[PDB]
Amino acid sequence: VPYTVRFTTTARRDLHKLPPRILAAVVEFAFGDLSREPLRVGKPLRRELAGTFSARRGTYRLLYRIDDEHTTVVILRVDHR
C-alpha cells in the first residue's frame, strides 16, 4: 500500500536549511501521510511544471514526483516560510 519515499541530494540540501522543528515536521509528513496518499496530500502542477506535484503544509511545501510503476515518491525541493 504505502509508497517508498526518497529525498534527492538536492532536496536533502534544502532540509539542512530548515529550523529543527520544521525539519522534524517535514520528515514525519514525508514518511507518514505523504507515503500513504501522495495524490491526496498534494496536487499535480501545470504548464512547464507538468509531471511534478506540490504538497502544501502549514509552514512548508514539498515538490515531488510520483512513480506509480515503482510505487515511489521522490522529493525534489523543500521550501519553508
Partner: protein, 92 residues
C-alpha cells in the same frame, strides 16, 4: 475541454456542470449578455493552479528541478532510515 457557455445553458444542470469540472481539468467560461462574466473550474484544478503559481515564482526553480532530475537518474536519493539517522529524527 474549454467550453464557453451561456448562463441559461448552465441553469438547471448545475449539479452536472459542477460534477464535470470537479473530476477534470475542464473549464467553463460563463457568459452573460454574450460577454464572459465568470469562470468555473474544479476545486482540485484551482489548487493545482495556485501551487503552480507559487512554484514558478521561486528563485532557481527550473535549475532545482533539473538538478533533482539528474539525482534521480543517477540514484542520488536517500530513504527513511538514512534521513532519520542523518537529521536525528528517530521513529516511534
Amino acid at each position: 475541454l474549454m467550453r464557453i457557455l451561456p448562463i441559461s445553458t448552465i441553469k438547471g444542470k448545475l449539479n452536472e456542470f459542477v460534477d464535470a469540472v470537479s473530476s477534470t481539468q475542464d473549464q467553463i467560461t460563463i457568459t452573460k449578455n454574450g460577454a464572459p462574466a465568470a469562470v468555473l473550474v474544479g476545486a482540485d484544478e484551482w489548487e493545482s493552479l495556485q501551487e503552480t503559481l507559487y512554484w514558478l515564482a521561486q528563485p532557481g526553480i527550473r535549475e532545482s528541478i533539473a538538478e533533482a532530475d539528474a539525482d534521480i537518474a543517477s540514484g542520488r536519493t536517500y530513504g527513511e532510515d538514512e534521513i532519520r539517522a542523518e537529521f536525528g529524527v528517530p521513529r516511534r
